[PDB]
Design a binder for this molecule. Structure first.
Ligand SMILES: OC[C@H]1O[C@@H](n2cnc3c(NCCc4ccccc4)ncnc32)[C@H](O)[C@@H]1O
Ligand SMILES: [K+]
Ligand SMILES: [K+]
Length: 545
DNA sequence: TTCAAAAAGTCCCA
DNA sequence: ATGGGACTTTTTGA
């Protein structure tokens, strides 16, 4: 329940907020961490503040009460007026209280530490500086009773499949003083995700974003499966609204290459570019000028989107795959009439242009009429998981029978020629499915609308969609999930724009040559690459890049 | 009635 | 033991 931020990142975040504080003008800054834990950030804040006061102690002594401003009084002053923390964990607060006390009895020094829920606490005043690492909890792992509170009181940033850390962004922004500075490390996903749309709008319209450090898929928290970014923002009145963006170039680097994070940011391991906050739409397209030019050329030249021409759908969700998915060689399939059996593939079965042969079968149990006619299937296959099946939401409410698929969709959508792609991948992998393949939600499908069949063929679409141009084009705005993994979900895949011009026939012909080679017995994988290079050239010519 | 989003992923191995 | 690679379920709000 407690996560330790790497020291190099803590120091960078504390420096980002305090390095230019004018302690002579304001010797009473309020610095807050609302998920302080054991004080990873606040103990560093103490050290930075102590040097700031000690370095200017005689100037403060002359300007203000000369009896109050002594070196011996710095410790008490910092704890009384400067450092604030909050955390839900009582033990963590107790440890941090001891650590702050031991930085140096008399009249006991009051320490501004609150054991509370920071999202419910009535905050009695605003703060100059806010730093830290909020909790990340998604829609599956968040308690449903608590979600009702968030859906009611944090509706500006929290809806649907949003995350708990969205609300910490809102709370931090709301209690930041005018002219104050906030700097936090959170997951990166809100920068592109559909769930983060309202959160992005709230940030854009209430603070100036000074800086975004985007580590992409790099592993910042050891043994933790999350991807991180650092956001620095302020509430200063300024006419300029440009964001510094530092995007890592190599996801494999060790974060401790130099003594400081800023050395790494200035190095060749990162790229830097600027983004005008006023030009942010509901989506934040954070790319350099070359990629922006590349992206805008494709957007302006393409007159159609996939959503215009195609029908998208998520795959089957059985609710318990072990109950319904069997190996095609499993002897228990002899109990199942073939009318109930469907071919079943996983995301790893999707290559560019074609799907591997299926190794698994789905029992489409929705077509089982009653429990008496097919008792052996129920007793010997599906019923082996009956307890877990009955715990599915729609079974408890009586919507589904215990042996039915939870979301069986429409068979007719799958039993047709269609394009399939994995939901998470390192590259564009769009394949024509010829074999009426079914799949779980790790594979998405679409088919072309009837009225667009004379303009776009399946063979033409997989040709451009698998090209190097469209791989780079999709990843410009794609949701980066982990190292070498992007989400390929319809909320972004169906926004891909496509074109139709004089190169259509040759692109389509090259695609059919590739498909014909890939479907042979002795695949000339080499020839396919050459044909792909030729198609990439045609596509680059068509789009004027 | 029934869609589609969601990595403090999950699991294994050298 | 850890860090890195292959691979991806079903719960959930709307
Ligand atoms: O690294 C994460 C750190 O953040 C702390 N923390 C977690 N949730 C907190 C919170 N409100 C949400 C309560 C909450 C959380 C989950 C479910 C229901 C309610 N208010 C303050 N601090 C919090 C953890 O102690 C840890 O030290
Ligand atoms: K004085
Ligand atoms: K990561």
């Amino acid at each position: 329940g407690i996560y330790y931020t790497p020291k190099i990142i803590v120091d960078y975040i504390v420096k980002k907020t305090l390095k230019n504080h004018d302690i002579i003008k304001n010797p009473y800054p309020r610095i807050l961490d609302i998920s302080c834990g054991c004080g990873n950030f606040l103990l560093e804040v103490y050290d930075i503040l102590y040097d700031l006061f000690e370095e200017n102690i005689y100037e403060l002594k002359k300007k203000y009460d000369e009896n109050y401003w002594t070196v011996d009084n710095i410790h008490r002053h910092i704890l009384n007026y400067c450092i604030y923390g909050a955390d839900i964990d009582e033990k963590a607060i107790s440890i941090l209280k001891d650590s702050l006390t031991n930085k140096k009895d008399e009249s006991d020094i009051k320490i501004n530490l609150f054991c509370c829920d920071s999202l419910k606490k009535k905050w009695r005043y605003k703060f100059d500086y806010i730093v830290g690492n909020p909790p990340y909890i998604g829609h599956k792992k968040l308690e449903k009773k608590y979600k009702k509170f968030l859906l009611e009181k944090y509706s500006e940033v929290y809806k649907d499949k949003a995350d708990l850390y969205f609300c910490f962004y809102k709370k931090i922004i709301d209690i930041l003083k005018q002219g104050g500075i906030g700097s936090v490390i959170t997951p990166r996903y809100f920068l592109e995700s559909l769930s983060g749309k309202d959160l992005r709008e709230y940030i854009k319209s209430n603070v100036n974003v000074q800086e975004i450090v985007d580590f992409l898929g790099a592993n910042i928290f050891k043994n933790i499966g999350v991807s991180s970014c650092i956001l620095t923002f302020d509430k200063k009145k300024t006419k300029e609204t440009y964001i510094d963006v530092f995007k890592i170039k190599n996801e494999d680097i060790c974060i401790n290459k130099f003594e400081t994070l800023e050395e790494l940011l200035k190095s060749s391991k990162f790229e830097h570019f600027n983004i005008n906050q006023r030009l942010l739409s509901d989506e934040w397209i954070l790319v350099n000028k070359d990629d922006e030019t590349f992206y805008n050329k494709i957007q302006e030249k393409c007159k159609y989107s996939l959503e215009d021409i195609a029908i998208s759908f998520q795959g089957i969700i059985t609710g318990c795959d072990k109950a319904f998915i069997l190996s095609k060689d499993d002897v228990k399939l002899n109990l199942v009439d073939d009318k109930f059996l469907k071919c079943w593939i996983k995301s790893k079965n999707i290559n560019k242009y074609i799907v591997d042969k299926s190794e698994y079968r789905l029992i489409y149990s929705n077509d089982i009429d009653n429990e008496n006619t097919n008792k052996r299937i129920l007793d010997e296959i599906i019923g082996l998981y009956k307890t877990k099946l009955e715990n599915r939401r729609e079974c408890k409410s009586g919507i589904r029978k215990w042996y039915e698929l939870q979301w069986g969709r429409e068979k007719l959508f799958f039993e047709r020629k269609k394009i399939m792609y994995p939901y998470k991948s390192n590259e564009n992998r769009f394949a024509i499915d010829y074999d009426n393949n079914f799949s779980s939600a790790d594979v998405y499908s679409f088919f072309i609308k009837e009225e667009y069949l004379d303009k776009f063929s399946y063979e033409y679409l997989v040709g451009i969609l698998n090209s190097s141009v469209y791989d780079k084009y999709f990843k410009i705005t794609a949701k980066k999930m982990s190292k070498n993994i992007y989400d390929y979900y319809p909320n972004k895949v169906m926004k891909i724009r496509i074109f139709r011009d004089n190169n259509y026939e040759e692109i389509e012909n090259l695609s059919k040559q590739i498909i014909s080679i890939l479907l042979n017995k002795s695949i000339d994988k080499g020839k396919v690459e050459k044909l792909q290079i030729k198609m990439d050239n045609l596509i680059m010519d068509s789009l004027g890049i």
